[PDB]
Design a binder for this molecule. Structure first.
Ligand SMILES: [Ca+2]
Ligand SMILES: [Zn+2]
Ligand SMILES: [Zn+2]
Lengths: 606, 145, 48
């Protein structure tokens, strides 16, 4: 302690004065730091946020400068523990509130899936969302992310359940590694399938042993890995989507009254599937708000019938259960002895199945598993797993989203192409039907124009892909009976169908690809040269060195805002400060005026 | 090193003609362009190879009797009686044919697999010719621009 | 050019007022500000 260049002799002797001397000249440093560090840490954090407030408010005072050098000597420990937020409310001025950030919260934020959720939210909130609902979407993302962080931190009857829980947690924790392993084994089995041959009788002939049984081994391994992938997904990401949907339907019931006064339409299948379990037993299973039922009862009971509300909302004939629990409630209750199963609610389970079978990602994993099962029958079905890179990479996802983007325009352009090809088909079937003799010796003429449907298929299949119209594959006129009309026909075909419509389709797809790429890089440029919360700009903070980077990493950090919301939620209210209670009331009433819209601390003060 | 090797085989002095590509400005721009979108070009070529392999396996399974690249024979030069040979044939002919793959193999002309073969040829000409090859060309030309 | 003109007309109808044409950011201060401004104060149907 005296040679580690961090202590003076007075400090070393003062700390040795705190020794125990347990009759053997031995101190337990474990118990020492377990006893003498935690309250010191708490009160040091308090005085640290006090000194930081004093600093960031009153600068340039030499007495406060010495106090601040001592402060920073303390703060070199409390830097990753204190967070600052710039609220705008209750004073019409920017206020820098300070709070504590837990190491567990930092770890759950650094967790992988949280980063993916964050980047997806950033992308879909800068692309689609504007600025009217930007803060609403940000608060929804914060709630979904703190739920995801809770889940990640969570990641005879006492012998099988305790093991299946650990197995499911292992799968949810190694879900992504399982995906990479599935991709690798798919590449391997597809290389083995590339090493193939035929004799009517398939045979892996290009090898000499050591390659036939490994194909079956890799096939069964890929199927097992796909099953593990879907099992891990169902317990890693399904909770998050069902939590999002439960939160949405619960807030629609409470605030808007979607199923009380403003019954949804007939085409919105989401509304009907939510009405399916607006009245189940365990409705808010993941929204951590088990009182939305009572809230909406108290809100819409004195107008539409309390009995009708309690009937259509579940928990029937229990309008006095609140009073029964408030006055002489039951202490506890044993689970059962004769009913070991069927305790779960089949209605809620069917709802969970119906919401996970429309997730558009669980469907992809189900397609993966089904293709693996079919590949077990015919090994060549494992080639469909090579399209997994198209979803795993970024630019390939962009190509697929591009070919899907201009859907209606592409379909209508292909329809116009088919229509003009049909017009050319009917004019050729009427007039120039003697030129479609696709034979060289015959002598049986293979007339491709003695049938309307055959001629139309021939046109649509040959004249579109011929690259030089249709006159370059049928016989030339070379006769002054229909020569000029046939030349006009060929030229108009090559113009309208080849160098206009096909070019228009290609341009539609390539422009969709370019627009998607440009949107992605525009989102990136906005995240790099513009603030998310306030959005004042980059040139304003490009005055001091590293100005904008420190502004986005210290003052207006989205991680800091999320940690502040989590702190307010886990703050045990009646202990909130003024600013904290104000922000909590705004968050409860769903107003979000406490975010700095077009101002900040630097624009407000010196 | 290329000069030393040209002292052995005089035709190695042709590699020195690429010095203008580094001496001029627009040629350096062309080379830097073909190098610029490296990851995107590699991934697009990979997707091209993957879709060509999918067409290869479907042709090797179903339409293996149309890949008879012979005129008199009488020994049939079946380019589809082998998976690797069929994949190389696809990747080498159907990508550069400019009109898909149906313009170099025999036409169906028979109502047993005709509609499926037409769908196969049209989807090949669409995805592989007028989309993916165009996307690669567009990547390189947009990098140059 | 035709497609771009169409989508420019759409973007101008969505992010700019027809009668006054002050802009969108000016009314993007209160929630639903521009939408209420174009649906209540400066409605073309109201003028007709
Ligand atoms: Ca208090
Ligand atoms: Zn900011
Ligand atoms: Zn106006």
């Amino acid at each position: 302690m005296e040679s580690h260049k961090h202590y003076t002799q007075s400090e070393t002797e003062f700390l040795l004065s705190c020794a125990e001397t347990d009759e053997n000249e031995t101190l337990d440093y474990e118990e020492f730091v377990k006893r003498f560090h935690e309250p010191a840490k708490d009160i040091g954090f308090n005085v640290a946020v006090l000194l930081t407030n004093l600093s960031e408010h009153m600068p340039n005072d030499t007495r406060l400068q010495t106090f601040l050098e001592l402060a920073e000597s303390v703060l070199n420990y409390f830097q990753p523990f204190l967070g600052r937020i710039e609220i705008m409310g209750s004073a019409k001025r920017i206020e820098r509130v300070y709070f504590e950030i837990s190491e567990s919260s930092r770890t759950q934020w650094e967790k992988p899936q949280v980063k993916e959720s964050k980047r997806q939210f950033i992308f879909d909130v800068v692309n689609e969302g504007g600025e009217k609902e930007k803060m609403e979407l940000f608060v929804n993302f914060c709630e979904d992310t703190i739920f995801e962080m809770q889940l990640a931190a969570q990641i005879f009857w006492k012998k099988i359940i305790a093991y299946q829980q650990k197995l499911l947690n292992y799968f949810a924790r190694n879900f992504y590694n399982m995906r990479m392993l599935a991709l690798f084994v798919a590449f391997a089995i597809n290389f083995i399938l590339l090493f193939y041959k035929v004799s009517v009788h398939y045979v892996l002939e290009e090898s000499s042993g050591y390659m036939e049984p490994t194909l079956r081994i890799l096939a069964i391994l890929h199927t097992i890995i796909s099953f593990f992938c879907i099992i891990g997904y169902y317990c890693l990401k399904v909770p998050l989507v069902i939590f999002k949907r439960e939160k949405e339907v619960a807030r629609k019931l409470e605030f808007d009254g979607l199923y009380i006064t403003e019954q949804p339409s007939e085409d919105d299948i989401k509304g009907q599937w939510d009405r399916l379990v607006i009245n189940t037993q365990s409705f808010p299973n993941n929204y951590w708000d088990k009182f939305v039922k009572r809230k909406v009862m108290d809100k819409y009971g004195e107008f539409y019938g309390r009995d009708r509300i309690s009937e259509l909302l579940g928990m029937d004939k229990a309008a006095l259960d609140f009073s029964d629990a408030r006055e002489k409630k039951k202490p506890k209750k044993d689970s059962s002895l004769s009913a070991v199963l069927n305790s779960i609610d089949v209605k809620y389970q069917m709802w969970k199945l119906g919401v996970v079978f429309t997730d558009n990602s669980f469907l992809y994993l189900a397609w993966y598993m089904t293709m693996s099962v079919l590949g077990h029958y015919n090994n060549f079905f494992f080639a469909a797993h090579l399209l997994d890179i198209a979803m795993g990479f970024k630019t390939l996802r962009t190509i697929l989203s591009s070919v899907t983007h201009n859907g209606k325009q592409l379909v209508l352009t292909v329809g116009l192409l088919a229509v003009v090809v049909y017009l050319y088909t009917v004019v050729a079937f009427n007039f120039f039907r003697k030129f479609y003799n696709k034979s060289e010796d015959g002598d049986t003429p293979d007339m491709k124009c003695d049938d309307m449907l055959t001629c139309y298929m021939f046109h649509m299949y040959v004249g579109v892909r011929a690259g030089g119209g249709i006159g370059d594959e049928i016989e030339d006129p070379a006769g002054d009976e229909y020569e000029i009309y046939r030349i006009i026909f060929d030229i108009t075909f090559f113009f309208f169908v080849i160098v206009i419509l096909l070019a228009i389709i290609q341009g539609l797809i390539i422009d969709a690809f370019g627009e998607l790429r440009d949107q992605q890089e525009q989102v990136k440029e906005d995240m790099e040269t513009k603030c998310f919360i306030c959005g004042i700009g980059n040139d304003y903070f490009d005055t001091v060195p590293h100005g904008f980077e420190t502004h986005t990493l210290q003052e207006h950090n989205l991680a800091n805002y999320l940690f502040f919301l989590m702190y307010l939620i886990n703050k045990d209210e009646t202990e909130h400060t003024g600013q904290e209670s104000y922000v909590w009331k705004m968050y409860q009433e769903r107003c979000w005026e406490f975010f700095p819209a077009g101002d900040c601390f630097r624009k407000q003060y010196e």
